[PDB]
Amino acid sequence: AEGDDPAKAAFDSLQASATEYIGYAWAMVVVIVGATIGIKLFKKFTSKAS
Amino acid sequence: AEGDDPAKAAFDSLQASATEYIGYAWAMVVVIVGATIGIKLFKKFTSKAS
Amino acid sequence: AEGDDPAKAAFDSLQASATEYIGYAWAMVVVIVGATIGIKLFKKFTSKAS
Amino acid sequence: AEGDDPAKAAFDSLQASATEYIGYAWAMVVVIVGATIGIKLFKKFTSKAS
Amino acid sequence: AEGDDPAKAAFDSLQASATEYIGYAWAMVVVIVGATIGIKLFKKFTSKAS
Amino acid sequence: AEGDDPAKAAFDSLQASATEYIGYAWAMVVVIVGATIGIKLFKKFTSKAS
Amino acid sequence: AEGDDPAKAAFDSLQASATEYIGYAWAMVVVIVGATIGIKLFKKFTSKAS
Amino acid sequence: AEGDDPAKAAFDSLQASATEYIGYAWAMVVVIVGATIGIKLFKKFTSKAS
Amino acid sequence: AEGDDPAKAAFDSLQASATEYIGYAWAMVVVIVGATIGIKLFKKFTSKAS
Amino acid sequence: AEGDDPAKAAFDSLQASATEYIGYAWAMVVVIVGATIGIKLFKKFTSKAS
Amino acid sequence: AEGDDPAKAAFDSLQASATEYIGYAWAMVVVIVGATIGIKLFKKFTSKAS
Amino acid sequence: AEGDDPAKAAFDSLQASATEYIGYAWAMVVVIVGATIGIKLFKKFTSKAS
Amino acid sequence: AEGDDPAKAAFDSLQASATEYIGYAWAMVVVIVGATIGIKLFKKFTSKAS
Amino acid sequence: AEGDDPAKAAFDSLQASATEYIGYAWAMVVVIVGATIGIKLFKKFTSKAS
Amino acid sequence: AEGDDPAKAAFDSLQASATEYIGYAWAMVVVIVGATIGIKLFKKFTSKAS
Numbered sequence: 001a002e003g004d005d006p007a008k009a010a011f012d013s014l015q016a017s018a019t020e021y022i023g024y025a026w027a028m029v030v031v032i033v034g035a036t037i038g039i040k041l042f043k044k045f046t047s048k049a050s
Numbered sequence: 051a052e053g054d055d056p057a058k059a060a061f062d063s064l065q066a067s068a069t070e071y072i073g074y075a076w077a078m079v080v081v082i083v084g085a086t087i088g089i090k091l092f093k094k095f096t097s098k099a100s
Numbered sequence: 101a102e103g104d105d106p107a108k109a110a111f112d113s114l115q116a117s118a119t120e121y122i123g124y125a126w127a128m129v130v131v132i133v134g135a136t137i138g139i140k141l142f143k144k145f146t147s148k149a150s
Numbered sequence: 151a152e153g154d155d156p157a158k159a160a161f162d163s164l165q166a167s168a169t170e171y172i173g174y175a176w177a178m179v180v181v182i183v184g185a186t187i188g189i190k191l192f193k194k195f196t197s198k199a200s
Numbered sequence: 201a202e203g204d205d206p207a208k209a210a211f212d213s214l215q216a217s218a219t220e221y222i223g224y225a226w227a228m229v230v231v232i233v234g235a236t237i238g239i240k241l242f243k244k245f246t247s248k249a250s
Numbered sequence: 251a252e253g254d255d256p257a258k259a260a261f262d263s264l265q266a267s268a269t270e271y272i273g274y275a276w277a278m279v280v281v282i283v284g285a286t287i288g289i290k291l292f293k294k295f296t297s298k299a300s
Numbered sequence: 301a302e303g304d305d306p307a308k309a310a311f312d313s314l315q316a317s318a319t320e321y322i323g324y325a326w327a328m329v330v331v332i333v334g335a336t337i338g339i340k341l342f343k344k345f346t347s348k349a350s
Numbered sequence: 351a352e353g354d355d356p357a358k359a360a361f362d363s364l365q366a367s368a369t370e371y372i373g374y375a376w377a378m379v380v381v382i383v384g385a386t387i388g389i390k391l392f393k394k395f396t397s398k399a400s
Numbered sequence: 401a402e403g404d405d406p407a408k409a410a411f412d413s414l415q416a417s418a419t420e421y422i423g424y425a426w427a428m429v430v431v432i433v434g435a436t437i438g439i440k441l442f443k444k445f446t447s448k449a450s
Numbered sequence: 451a452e453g454d455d456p457a458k459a460a461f462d463s464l465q466a467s468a469t470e471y472i473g474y475a476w477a478m479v480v481v482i483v484g485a486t487i488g489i490k491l492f493k494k495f496t497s498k499a500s
Numbered sequence: 501a502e503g504d505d506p507a508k509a510a511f512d513s514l515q516a517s518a519t520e521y522i523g524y525a526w527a528m529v530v531v532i533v534g535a536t537i538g539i540k541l542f543k544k545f546t547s548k549a550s
Numbered sequence: 551a552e553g554d555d556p557a558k559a560a561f562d563s564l565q566a567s568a569t570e571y572i573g574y575a576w577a578m579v580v581v582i583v584g585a586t587i588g589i590k591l592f593k594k595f596t597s598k599a600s
Numbered sequence: 601a602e603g604d605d606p607a608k609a610a611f612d613s614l615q616a617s618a619t620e621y622i623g624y625a626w627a628m629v630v631v632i633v634g635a636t637i638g639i640k641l642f643k644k645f646t647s648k649a650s
Numbered sequence: 651a652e653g654d655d656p657a658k659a660a661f662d663s664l665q666a667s668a669t670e671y672i673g674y675a676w677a678m679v680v681v682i683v684g685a686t687i688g689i690k691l692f693k694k695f696t697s698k699a700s
Numbered sequence: 701a702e703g704d705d706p707a708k709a710a711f712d713s714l715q716a717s718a719t720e721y722i723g724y725a726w727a728m729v730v731v732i733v734g735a736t737i738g739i740k741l742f743k744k745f746t747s748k749a750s
Binding site: 602603604606607610614617618621622624625628629632 | 719730734737738741748
Binding site for chain 12: 413417420421424427428431432434435438439442443445446449450
């Protein structure tokens with residue numbers, strides 16, 4: 001009980017922080033996927049011309 | 051007997067506390083797996099465009 | 101049992117979110133395929149004239 | 151014997167729970183594969199027009 | 201001799217019990233591997249369509 | 251020996267299930283290829299007229 | 301010496317069992333590869349018509 | 351909190367750098383697609399003469 | 401009481417020092433992950449060209 | 451001296467026995483790697499057809 | 501030395517087996533390419549008539 | 551404090567060294583990606599001729 | 601420092617070797633592309649006659 | 651010193667043996683890549699005919 | 701003081717010896733990584749041909 005209270009709260013803080021990192025992950029992949037969408041579009045142009 | 055009663059109860063309390071920690075574990079992994087599902091979905095988009 | 105309940109629900113939420121992403125995927129490809137239909141139609145005109 | 155009985159049963163419960171998670175897995179992949187079937191169909195249209 | 205007889209038998213019982221646990225292990229992994237076979241099959245479908 | 255028997259049988263069941271999925275795969279591609287045969291036939295008509 | 305004899309034999313049995321599992325592996329992949337050969341053949345038909 | 355601050359910033363820097371690489375990607379494909387547009391134009395001339 | 405005071409403070413100092421080491425850890429992994437982001441970007445270029 | 455002689459010899463015997471076990475290890479991994487070579491070859495066939 | 505001898509030989513056997521699989525691969529593709537040569541010849545006839 | 555100072559500095563040196571290795575990594579991938587750009591360009595020529 | 605020097609040099613040697621392989625790659629594709637240029641030229645003759 | 655001499659030499663022998671295994675690795679991949687070069691050549695023929 | 705002097709020196713010798721072992725480690729991994737660079741290059745060739 002008493003001992004595990006501060007620890008439970010600590011785990012909550014750790015979980016929230018994990019969520020912050022995870023948000024950054026979603027974003028990073030937003031850039032990479034953005035790059036893939038654009039570049040694959042270049043390829044699309046090329047094929048249409050072909 | 052007499053001596054081990056309080057100890058048995060103490061072990062029950064310890065086990066329950068362990069269950070609390072364990073619940074937090076399931077949750078933490080819920081966030082991480084959520085991140086993996088979303089980001090792998092970004093990758094899915096990229097491949098479909100490709 | 102008890103521990104895996106919150107986790108099952110979490111997985112449901114994750115699955116639904118996956119469905120949202122997936123809807124966006126169908127749409128994105130709607131635009132790309134729209135582009136292919138139109139442009140291939142331009143090619144059709146050219147061939148008919150030829 | 152005596153000690154390992156409750157443990158055997160516990161393992162049964164754990165195995166069943168594992169089956170629940172696993173069912174959710176089959177489903178999640180049902181959505182993802184559904185997305186792949188549909189989107190690859192969009193690509194099919196595009197190629198046929200081409 | 202005399203003292204170690206009951207102990208040898210006890211070790212036999214312990215070994216047999218260990219075998220029971222171990223059987224449950226083989227099974228648990230049967231479910232997990234079953235899940236992997238099925239889901240990887242979903243992926244197979246997706247690739248074939250692609 | 252003893253331990254691996256149930257596991258061998260489990261693997262047999264898994265293999266058979268894999269065969270079921272695989273049958274569905276052959277079918278799915280039957281529809282897609284059917285679509286390609288028909289539509290390419292439309293193209294055939296067009297060229298013959300041309 | 302004496303102690304490691306039964307253990308060497310045990311390892312032989314374990315190795316043989318491993319061979320049984322491994323045979324099942326070769327087979328499972330026989331089905332999957334069979335599926336890939338057939339389905340890729342469907343794709344072949346489609347392309348030839350195209 | 352305290353520990354994850356420097357890490358969040360580090361991830362920001364990493365994301366920005368990723369954007370730089372990605373810009374170079376868009377450019378590289380600009381050259382390749384430029385090549386495809388020009389060369390397919392050569393083919394266009396040839397067909398028109400034909 | 402009296403004896404454990406200096407020890408509590410000592411543990412505080414030890415904990416803070418642990419935090420310093422831990423900061424260095426976050427940083428070290430910042431470099432490694434930076435390397436992975438860049439190099440995986442090289443791979444991205446290669447695939448886009450492909 | 452005198453006491454450690456029989457012990458040195460005992461250690462030699464133990465080392466040799468360890469070598470026997472170790473030989474079995476190399477073999478066991480021979481089977482597993484054999485399985486991986488064959489099955490990855492099945493995958494090779496599939497890709498070539500694709 | 502001693503330990504790695506049997507392993508080297510095992511690797512030789514594995515390599516030879518790999519060669520057998522690989523021969524089957526060359527053959528399988530012989531059939532597929534044979535099919536492509538014949539069918540493309542049908543197309544040749546059609547065009548010549550056209 | 552006192553004990554962890556030399557260790558902090560040691561970790562700094564280790565981190566810097568890690569950066570050196572990492573630089574070599576970026577370079578190695580520069581060669582590999584260079585190879586991919588060139589060779590994919592060969593493929594580009596072939597397709598343009600086709 | 602001291603430890604990572606020999607390793608840095610080792611990485612240099614590895615990188616150079618990678619360059620050798622890569623040169624062979626450029627060449628191999630020189631032959632394949634040569635084949636494509638020639639054969640597509642055969643096709644050119646055929647079309648001109650047509 | 652004295653104790654680590656035999657160990658250093660032992661490590662040399664182990665490293666050399668590792669080199670033998672590694673040579674076999676380069677070879678095994680020589681066969682696999684040979685198979686890929688040949689079979690991809692079959693595909694080349696098919697496309698040229700097409 | 702007096703007693704710990706010879707021990708400090710002994711620890712220095714032990715540390716230096718540890719450095720020797722560690723050098724051998726860097727080397728061993730030089731061979732393994734060399735093998736990975738070469739073999740992955742074989743794979744590179746195969747993909748380029750594909």
